[PDB]
Design a protein around this ligand. Structure first.
Ligand SMILES: *[C@@H]1O[C@H](CO[C@@H]2O[C@@H](C)[C@@H](O)[C@@H](O)[C@@H]2O)[C@@H](O[C@@H]2O[C@H](CO)[C@@H](O)[C@H](O)[C@H]2NC(C)=O)[C@H](O)[C@H]1NC(C)=O
Ligand SMILES: *[C@@H]1O[C@H](CO)[C@@H](O[C@@H]2O[C@H](CO)[C@@H](O)[C@H](O)[C@H]2NC(C)=O)[C@H](O)[C@H]1NC(C)=O
Ligand SMILES: O=C(N[C@H]1CCS[C@H]2CCC[C@@H](C(=O)O)N2C1=O)[C@@H](S)Cc1ccccc1
Ligand SMILES: *[C@@H]1O[C@H](CO[C@@H]2O[C@@H](C)[C@@H](O)[C@@H](O)[C@@H]2O)[C@@H](O)[C@H](O)[C@H]1NC(C)=O
Ligand SMILES: [Cl-]
Ligand SMILES: [Zn+2]
Length: 608
């Protein structure tokens, strides 16, 4: 480690620790930037060499965290928890958490390299036929979204899960062991316990379970209503009205949101098509237009536009030069207060417009807290970060707003168009809730040892059936590693943040709509051009992680905890309607035939 990055001598008291923190975060900006820069070069251009360079940067980051962590324990380990400055206590507590810098050098290299190889496998895996080959994005994504051929959907689902998951499993086992070894030396029972510590809530898991209990009836009724529609399309042979739904039939490779089968379950197909994708294509929208439209929503709230460095440096379309890239959408802070970027293989669809807003919400956060010391350049918690752009997307998706931006002819404020809209939104938001909850239940069990390699897939499908009420459409065994076929697992991105975000965003929406002076139904609110709403949001974003998220949340919504009531209030009308439809059709809520799996299509896979 270069001498200019190594820690100096400071007095072992709070005054000295304030200077210590200043010195730490001036040198951390330089180290963070070289790490982020090298990850960018790899993720937009996957090669062996860019992997080598990203690993050299990670090693340097670990030398740096080691030097400053040790010094902080040396100087302040007995005293810092009694510092009177609460922001300083946060910074010091973070610095003395070394994570993978606790590993000896050779295990640092093995850990850094497992990450590179798992990333490569996920983002370069292909599904080949009997002879070109399909990538996840756009090819398999488009098939899962738009094909209504059971056998084609099956070939894509099985092909993807086999191609990504199987080769990842031995690597994922090795990564898990090294991660745990590292964080045990910070005092955590396992890596999962460290991830959970970010929410600074002793009742976190209980609080999440309580939340899910209030939401599950909504999901169960949505599930039964959709299962009935799939039964009509595919037949009693492939759909069991009292069993789990085959996992390839819900419009999405992971069955995690169902908006792509809206056209199949829309009760009132005579009414205007609330999926404006066709109009977007008709009108010639491109990725740049989508990002500019999102930007203008932010500036309408008097938040910040995207800076020149964003437009010059971001990757907004999949490269056509054949380069391999990580296509999964992501947002990047280079910790130099100047460079901020999105990397997204943008497609022209309505759901991609929502994802553009999701990613730009991250950038806005970065811009609002870029002048905090680096340790506070974080969401109040990770769920806050994932929620920001989704909140704006809630306003954008209203038929009123879509009409304002030229994507929909005005609809009638009647009950039936209301039901169409809330149902489309339920397919996007309610259907996700079980998946957002279960992914880290699986991963926490892996980190804790409750789920050894011998049960990776057994416990994954236990949770997928328990929570989502789906089943694999072909037999699986422990050679398969179906959790590995979901980006965040090999790319080691925690997931409970998305469950938190999907609850939180309705708490935020309700607060911002009240602040805008809106007084109609919550699900028709559009906060566009509300400078009052923008001001309330700006307060959150500029706080970073300098204050406890419970306090930041109370300032914003009036309450110091996650709360399902705003989401329930948003969906109330369709919650009731779905309950009624299910009763009239005599549905069974849930999936009591929990063992059921569909048969294979005749002659599969030969007829394609
Ligand atoms: C749309 O109409 C609502 C009124 O609800 C209607 O009632 C049903 C019987 C059926 O007609 C639904 O399709 C309708 O939505 C308006 O909401 C009211 O706004 C006032 C304003 O002061 C407010 O005080 C009331 O509480 C609101 N009532 C309800 C039931 O929420 C709403 O503003 C209209 N919005 C648009 C965009 O047309
Ligand atoms: C993708 O990354 C590779 C490095 O792995 C880049 O290849 C280098 O390209 C520069 C061009 O300025 C040459 O000077 C080097 O000799 C190349 N090195 C190797 C090993 O090929 C490549 O340019 C990158 N591609 C893009 C589109 O940025
Ligand atoms: O979050 C992300 N990207 C989005 C894009 C699609 S929308 C969104 C909401 C639903 C849940 C989740 C889903 O798709 O699985 N999700 C995403 O992953 C990125 S910022 C996460 C990331 C962080 C660091 C490095 C790399 C990636
Ligand atoms: C695991 O599964 C592998 C492939 O799946 C198999 O093929 C389908 C068509 C069905 O026959 C299904 O029952 C099978 O699982 C097998 O190659 C492998 O032997 C299976 N067992 C193990 C231990 O890997
Ligand atoms: Cl998280
Ligand atoms: Zn995100």
């Amino acid at each position: 480690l270069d001498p200019g990055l190594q820690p100096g001598q400071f007095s072992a008291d709070e005054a000295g620790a304030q200077l210590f923190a200043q010195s730490y975060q001036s040198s951390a900006e330089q180290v963070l930037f070289q790490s982020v820069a090298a990850s960018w070069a790899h993720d937009t251009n996957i090669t062996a060499e860019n992997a080598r360079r990203q690993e050299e940067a990670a090693l340097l980051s670990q030398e740096f965290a080691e030097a400053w962590g040790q010094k902080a324990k040396e100087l302040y380990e007995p005293i810092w928890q009694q510092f009177t400055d609460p922001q300083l206590r946060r910074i010091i507590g973070a610095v003395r958490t070394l994570g993978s810098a606790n590993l000896p050098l050779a295990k640092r290299q093995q850990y850094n390299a497992l990450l590179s190889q798992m990333s490569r496998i996920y983002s370069t895996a292909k599904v080949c036929l009997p002879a070109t080959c399909w990538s996840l994005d756009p090819d398999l994504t488009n098939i899962l979204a738009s094909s209504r051929s059971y056998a084609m959907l099956l070939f894509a689902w099985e092909g993807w899960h086999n191609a990504a998951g199987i080769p990842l499993k031995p690597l994922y086992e090795d990564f898990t062991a090294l991660s745990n070894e590292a964080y045990k030396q910070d005092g955590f029972t396992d890596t999962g316990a460290y991830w959970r510590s970010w929410y600074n809530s002793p009742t976190f898991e209980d609080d999440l379970e309580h939340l899910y209990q209030q939401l599950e009836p909504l999901y169960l009724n949505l599930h039964a209503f959709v299962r009935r529609a799939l039964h009509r399309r595919y037949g009693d042979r492939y759909i069991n009205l009292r069993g789990p739904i085959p996992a390839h039939l819900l419009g999405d490779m992971w069955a995690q949101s169902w908006e792509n089968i809206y056209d199949m379950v829309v009760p009132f197909p005579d009414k205007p098509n609330l999926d404006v994708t066709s109009t977007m294509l008709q009108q010639g929208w491109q990725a740049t237009h989508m990002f500019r439209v999102a930007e203008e929503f932010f500036t309408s709230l008097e938040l910040s536009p995207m800076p020149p460095e964003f437009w010059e440096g971001s990757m907004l379309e999949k490269p056509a030069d054949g380069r391999e890239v990580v296509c999964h959408a992501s947002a990047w802070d280079f910790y130099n207060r100047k460079d901020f970027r999105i990397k997204q293989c943008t497609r022209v669809t309505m759901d991609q417009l929502s994802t553009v807003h999701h990613e730009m919400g991250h950038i806005q956060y970065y811009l609002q807290y870029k002048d905090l010391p680096v340790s506070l350049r974080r969401g109040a918690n990770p769920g806050f970060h994932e929620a920001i752009g989704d909140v704006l997307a809630l306003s954008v998706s209203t038929p009123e707003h879509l009409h304002k931006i030229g994507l929909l002819d005005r609809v009638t404020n009647d009950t039936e168009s209301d039901i169409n809209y809330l149902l489309k939104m339920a397919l996007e938001k309610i259907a996700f809730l079980p998946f957002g909850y279960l992914v880290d239940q699986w991963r926490w069990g892996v980190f804790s040892g409750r789920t050894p390699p011998s049960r990776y897939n057994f416990d994954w499908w236990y949770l997928r059936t328990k929570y989502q009420g789906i089943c694999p459409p072909v037999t699986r065994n422990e050679t398969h590693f179906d959790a590995g076929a979901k980006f965040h697992v090999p790319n080691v991105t925690p997931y409970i943040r998305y469950f938190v975000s999907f609850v939180l965003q309705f708490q935020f929406h309700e607060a911002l709509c009240k602040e805008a002076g809106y007084e109609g139904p919550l699900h028709q609110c559009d906060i566009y051009r509300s400078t009052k709403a923008g001001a309330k949001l700006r307060k959150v974003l500029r706080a970073g992680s300098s204050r406890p998220w419970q306090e930041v949340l109370k300032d914003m919504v009036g309450l110091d905890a996650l709360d399902a009531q705003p989401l329930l209030k948003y969906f109330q009308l369709v919650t009731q309607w779905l309950q009624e439809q299910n009763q009239q059709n005599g549905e069974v809520l849930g999936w009591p035939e929990y063992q059921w799996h569909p048969p294979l299509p005749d002659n599969y896979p030969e007829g394609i």
